[PDB]
Design a protein around this ligand. Sequence first.
Ligand SMILES: [Cl-]
Ligand SMILES: [Cl-]
Ligand SMILES: [Cl-]
Length: 129
Amino acid sequence: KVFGRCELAAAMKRHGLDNYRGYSLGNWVCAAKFESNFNTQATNRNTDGSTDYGILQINSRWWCNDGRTPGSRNLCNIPCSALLSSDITASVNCAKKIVSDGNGMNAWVAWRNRCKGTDVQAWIRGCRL
Ligand SMILES: [Cl-]
Ligand SMILES: [Cl-]
Ligand SMILES: [Cl-]
């Protein structure tokens, strides 16, 4: 599923991400826009053989099992395919563990390079939340 901006903001809000660990909702919308273009089916392979999955491009080296990333951990305890669903629940729950790990949203390279320090509230302007 390809979400619209406001539709995704509302789904994220309902799943408890607005101000989760101090990150306002617009941070999470901005990250999803530049990680996946709001497409739950996005996959991208990394140089190390790991793969990133879903709307938040969660990486198979630490966070999920895809059966092809040798010596990887599965810290969210889920198959990586569950992250590609039209229901963002699994992605959201895993993201909450990632952002709690110590580096906050810096774990998402596109957040750090494209969202961090910008006016992220613009990502939720116009939305009925
Ligand atoms: Cl915001
Ligand atoms: Cl893994
Ligand atoms: Cl933080």
